[PDB]
Amino acid sequence: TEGRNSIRYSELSPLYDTTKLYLVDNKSADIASLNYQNDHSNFLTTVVQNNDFTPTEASTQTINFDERSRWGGQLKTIMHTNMPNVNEYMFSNKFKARVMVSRKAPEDHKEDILKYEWFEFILPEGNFSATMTIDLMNNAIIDNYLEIGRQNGVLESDIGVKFDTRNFRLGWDPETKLIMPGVYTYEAFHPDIVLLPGCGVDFTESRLSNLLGIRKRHPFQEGFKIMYEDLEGGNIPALLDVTAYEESKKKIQPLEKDSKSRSYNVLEDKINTAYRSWYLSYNYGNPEKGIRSWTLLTTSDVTCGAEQVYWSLPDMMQDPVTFRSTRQVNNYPVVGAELMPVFSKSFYNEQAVYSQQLRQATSLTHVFNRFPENQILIRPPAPTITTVSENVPALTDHGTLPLRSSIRGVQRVTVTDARRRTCPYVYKALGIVAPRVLSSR
Amino acid sequence: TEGRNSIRYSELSPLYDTTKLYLVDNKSADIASLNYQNDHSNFLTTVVQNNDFTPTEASTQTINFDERSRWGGQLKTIMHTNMPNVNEYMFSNKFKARVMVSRKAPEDHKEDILKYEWFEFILPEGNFSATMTIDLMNNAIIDNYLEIGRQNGVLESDIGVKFDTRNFRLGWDPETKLIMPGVYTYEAFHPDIVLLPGCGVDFTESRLSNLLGIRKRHPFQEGFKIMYEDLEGGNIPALLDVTAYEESKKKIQPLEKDSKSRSYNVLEDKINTAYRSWYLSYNYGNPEKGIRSWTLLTTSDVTCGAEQVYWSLPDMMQDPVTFRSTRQVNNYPVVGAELMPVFSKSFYNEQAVYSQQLRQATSLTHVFNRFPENQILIRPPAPTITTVSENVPALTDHGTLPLRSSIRGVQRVTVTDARRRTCPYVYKALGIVAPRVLSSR
Amino acid sequence: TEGRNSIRYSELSPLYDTTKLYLVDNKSADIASLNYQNDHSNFLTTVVQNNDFTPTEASTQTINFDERSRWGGQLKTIMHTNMPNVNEYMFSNKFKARVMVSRKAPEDHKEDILKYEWFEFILPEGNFSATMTIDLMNNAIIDNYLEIGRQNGVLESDIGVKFDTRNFRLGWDPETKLIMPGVYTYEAFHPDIVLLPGCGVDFTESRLSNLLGIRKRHPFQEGFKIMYEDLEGGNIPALLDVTAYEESKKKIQPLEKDSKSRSYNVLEDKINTAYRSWYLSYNYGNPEKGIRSWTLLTTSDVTCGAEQVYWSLPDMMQDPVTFRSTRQVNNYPVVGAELMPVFSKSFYNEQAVYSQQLRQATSLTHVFNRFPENQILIRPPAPTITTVSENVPALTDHGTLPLRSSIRGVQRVTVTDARRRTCPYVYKALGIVAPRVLSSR
Amino acid sequence: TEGRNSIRYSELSPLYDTTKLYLVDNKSADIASLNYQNDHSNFLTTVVQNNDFTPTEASTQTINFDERSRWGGQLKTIMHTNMPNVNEYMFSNKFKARVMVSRKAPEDHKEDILKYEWFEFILPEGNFSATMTIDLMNNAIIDNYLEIGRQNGVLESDIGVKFDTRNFRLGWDPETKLIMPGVYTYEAFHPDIVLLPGCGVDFTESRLSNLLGIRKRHPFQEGFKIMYEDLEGGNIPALLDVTAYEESKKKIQPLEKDSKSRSYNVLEDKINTAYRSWYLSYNYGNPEKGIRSWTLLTTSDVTCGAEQVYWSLPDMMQDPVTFRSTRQVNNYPVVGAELMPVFSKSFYNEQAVYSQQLRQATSLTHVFNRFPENQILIRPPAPTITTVSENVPALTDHGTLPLRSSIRGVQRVTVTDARRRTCPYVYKALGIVAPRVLSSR
């Protein structure tokens, strides 16, 4: 083992069989000279710590480890990131739906031809919770109504899509098939979608379908769209009229108008309305047809997907097996993998209804909750547990890999995504390599 | 060690005695070609990172490690899951009980033959807390009463089963054997069950018996059912009448009717009612007969059971000892074991009674708490600590195992349950294998 | 190293120098055949994973590792438990005290001979906080008074023992030696005990002395009992009368009767009462005699003692040094040690007085706080921080130990206490052994 | 290996091939003798534990490890620090802006020449949250107005810079281009800046730009300043007058004066005011010109930058490769790197508006929120999640490095910054070195 384990720089003393190599980015010389167009995910840094050499003339010395021995040293990384919840880079603020336009009469409810098209709604970006994002989704539909649908003959009783977090079944007397208290329960179950005949939603090439918790049984197929004609057996039951009920006590019928004459779209029967729900058609319906054979129920996910991240270092380590040696930017043979450092955290406000009753009195006149009298179009209640994403630092150890014989003065580092593109939310990157001796030659 | 440690792919340069092998699932080529019917728990992926080959024609190259040496490399996995609390896959929304039907008079309390049968109640699914699941269990009994028992001669004073979280003994004056304040304590101890003569509950092939905290001393026997005739010495003491007490002060007897004439089923004595409780018969009864010799008292468990999970990988590693080499799906020799990544977390609301007094005023008219005047049938109070499950990622290191000589291009992975079936709630799976050299040949 | 490292089962292929061995308990064949009388702490399981053999006929095959080599493999365990705070198994619901009975007059306060004896109070079991357990201790004294002491001549002013969490000194004007506001401070310091002449408490063979925080300087001596004659220099100062004070302003004396004529047992002087306190005699007294030379002050401990746990495995590993090879159940040579997985957690309610003022208005008429007018017998205030125990899973690595040459098909596992008895609160146990090669033969 | 592995001190027994060496700073002899001018980041300590020698005469003995062998031992450190959020050492309380002075009339809004200059505001230091620092920034502008701007002709309607956390777009009816409720939403989104024509802010050589979350796409360029002429397409829309609206109902125009006649600087149109916002010009503007092509949106960062820290030890370890052996203080060859132990933590107050409505009634008359009637100059609302930094201890393991042959009695330690200067907030430093044997000689 002796003799063949020296580490010569060029003119200093030779070391023996253990050093360290620091890949930092906070040198004050590289900022003005080498790195001028690139950022913390694709920077270019030096290894020599000599400061008799500007880094343009330090790109010539070679730290040549001794030959007749195979070398190789382990890798330790420290990265630290800060990305928001909703952003444009990871496709988290887009969803397209199909809502109604141009309700006009031709020249009796056997008239009024309705029209429909697709839109690709877009909501703002920031770091939000799991409930505030629902209110931002439910604003991207109404500001389409205030632009296009109001000037035509739409009368704000047939919007079509509305994201809600209730169960429209509690209180269903099976003898009369109506809800007894004359109001729906203001309780906070799993979120769902509410449709209307002629509408639908599409979550293809988006990421908000992980936030709601509506997955798919075969997650590799073609795409993910939900129409009105898939929610069979999931109509919301009609609401009993209680102010026209006490004439029997000095008789029973559904309610149709609520203080402003908004129709509930009650059908020809006197049992249920014309609104279909996802959560009510998943377990109160048929476990063979429609839904429950096509999707799956899942808890909410605020960080909306945990993707992997690839470290690359193509001037020190040798290439792993089945990798082509290239200098194109988006191939760069991978030296280690990790997970993206974005976690989740629960908080348990526990009130969630008084804290919603009082919040829209000192902070919010009517900007959210525009329709505070209709029971279906009312604001959804907040859950008793709330979840917010957070960013933590990550300390990792990637094991040993063989390294080259001669190491150049300037070095590249690269931190990529799963689709080979640099993540712009990386704030700090830092690595330490410690070479050892392996088998002889 | 030299010479016999080369790693030849087929046409690239030979490596020496350390590489890495990435088993990812997020390749954009495998989605359209190989994996079309299966999901993240049973997928099929490639190892070659060459991108001159579609993965149908990359299933031919062999990464043959060198012979005349025994190889073997350690394994590191990263999995991430999201399952709800109550679901159908792990038998967490079923329990059967025996309640009453058809109370009619034959042609004096020596009449009215009562009947009884079993039902297998079913409650909805989602992610709930430890108290909201109690209210969902206590709704699956009343909606049977509103369907079958109300149309027969049942008068809603003899329901039979009711899940409660109180202690019906605090305030028991031993001289007069009645409760002095004329009301039970609205305090929040361990949950129990409340029976009535002719009823019972059965938790065989279910999992909700871990949520309540009612275990069994010999947990391997046959099953787990609790009848009325096991709770001997656990009758709830009768409640003293205080509004007919101040006639002595210008005398003592139990109370029978409460503002709506609901009978408390007071016995022939004037001491105790005809309701038996589990918690009151476990420590105030007999430590030899009945209960305390058959069950055990345990804290609540929201995740309801911590089961193990098995990794399988039958194209790279060799088979461990006493395993048969097969290609049936539900045998697949196991390469490592872990724990299912579902934890628990406490929150301490600390109010739990004002936050229950005020919650059913802005959110809930009478949907829960249907009987808000009877002391036994009243809503149970919430504990001062609440517990909710949560899902975290899991980073594991499984040590070294010997691997085969030639590795095919396409590889299988499989993540199973304890009863050899694929868990559908796995969202991300990821592995890294790093081969080393062992003994020679 | 080659040649002498084979692992033959009996009829499969021979492995080489690394396997794994799974000691699971969730096999569906062992439940019906082998394990029928025992539980998760002392079960009996198989190693062969062949399923051509029922485990009664699989107790014959031997996985014989190769001779002429010393073997040995490391151990990894996963255990998961759920025990309550207060229970009978770990002596956490017993304490004996000496209170008063039979105050009768012989035939002037030179009469009324008093009597005293010991009782061994017992309180119920469950999972409670650090303050609710104080209220349960303070109920086990009053229900003795309502049974035996009330029928004799005891007049509920001389109970004798009362667990309190205040400091009865704040507001002591040194000129007049009385408390100025006419009320004690309703503040929430360390808990103590309150005695009365002729009483005492004994915490021998109990565990609640760790919950209060009253330790002992020499913790190995004989036992732990505290009488009235040890608290010298710790009398509570008497309370100034303020309603008979404003006659000086159109004079100073202690108060004796409080709205129901309960005597404070004021002494012959007009300075202090006849109640002694532990916390007030520990630091306001003498640091040489009495207390402060015999006990110690310690923070509260909700889990009440962290005991160790021993793993045993007497069919695979060899015996460690100085252990006798036996098959009695309560010796079983130990293969590794851990800690019991019961932690503590703080919550900081921060109100603790309004949340106590309002709690006994919607939940509690007078069941606790029976005497809500006497200042000494009033309910103690809750601390501003509260602590509750919790149960977490435990992942441990115990290092390497040498194992036997031939391994039988059926195996024993055992998880014991520090006094060699099986803990009944173990819910899941799981181990993995991975053999390696050590020195030759 | 035998023979050549002795460790001779000078006169004790020789050890063999494993010891430990403790670098503590809490010796009571070094405080009075060696360390008299320096602190915990640059102290000077001994290794001999003999106490027959004062450390002035213990700087002569040499713990000479054996020659004809290369030695080297691993390093473990324990450091513990306490730095505030806002301080002077890390440039966290400085920002310069350009506000207005000397509005006087020359001798019709075609007069009143305005003047502008730069100031370098300075705010106090301490440990604050993410919202209280915003209020301290917004006080450093007004106390300039009360000193210089009030005595000239400035009329407190044209301050110019104001840090706000709202979105001034919610409620924008696209038909009339005004905000319908007549008030802005008191909601708590990402923070931004609010400008006025003729002003600007500069965050060069500061650190508060990481607290707001306004990053830059190329983070290496020259500096970071934001003027009014970069925020094109981001004017705040004007506010509709609702008290002059009900004359149509027994008509629509912007509002200009608010109860004290403060002008909103409404433009020649009747659509929008003359205030530009950052958050409203980032996503409602142009994704090609102005902003969104130059900056980036990021969550808040309370610790404001995670910098690295360097351990140095220039009397025991040998120098790593490409380091010059020197005794100047600010070079000192680095033996290991870490991260600064300052983390972040979220708390979720959840009220944030009632807790702001009530906070400025019992604690704050008008010191903050000086203008509680103007909608633009009102106090910004607090977020529903708040983040505070915290300090934790750090336990690290730095691997092995080769050490010298003879070790002197006195030793140096040094803990530096990224710009080679001693951090004054280090409270405890502690290291343990354990030598082993490497290759022979």
Author numbering:
A (entry chain x), B (entry chain s), C (entry chain u), D (entry chain o): 49 to 155, 171 to 313, 367 to 557
From the primary publication:
We created ADDomer, an adenovirus-derived multimeric protein-based self-assembling nanoparticle scaffold engineered to facilitate plug-and-play display of multiple immunogenic epitopes from pathogens. The penton-forming protomer of certain adenovirus serotypes can self-assemble into a symmetric, hollow dodecahedron adopted by 12 pentons comprising altogether 60 protomers, effectively representing a proteinaceous, nonenveloped VLP. The protomer represents a two-domain architecture, with a crown region comprising the VL and RGD loop abutting a jellyroll fold mediating multimerization. The RGD loop contains a conserved tripeptide motif (-RGD-) mediating integrin-based internalization into target cells.
We used cryo–electron microscopy at near-atomic resolution and implemented novel, cost-effective, high-performance cloud computing to reveal architectural features in unprecedented detail. Close inspection of our cryo-EM structure reveals notable differences. The fiber-binding cleft adopts a rearranged conformation, seemingly in between the geometries observed in the crystals of apo- and fiber-bound Ad3 dodecahedron. In our cryo-EM structure, we observed additional density in between the crown and jellyroll domains, juxtaposed to four sulfur-containing amino acids (M131, M138, M458, and C539), consistent with a tetradentate coordination by a metal ion, possibly zinc or iron. We posit that a structural metal ion at this interdomain interface could be important for stabilizing this protein fold. No corresponding density is observed by cryo-EM. Consequently, glutamates E466 do not extend into the cavity, but the corresponding α-helices are slightly shifted in the ADDomer. Rather, in ADDomer, two neighboring protomers engage in hydrogen bonds in the vicinity of the twofold axis, extending from the S61 side chain to the peptide backbone of E59 and vice versa. We did not observe either of these features by cryo-EM and thus wondered about ramifications for ADDomer stability.
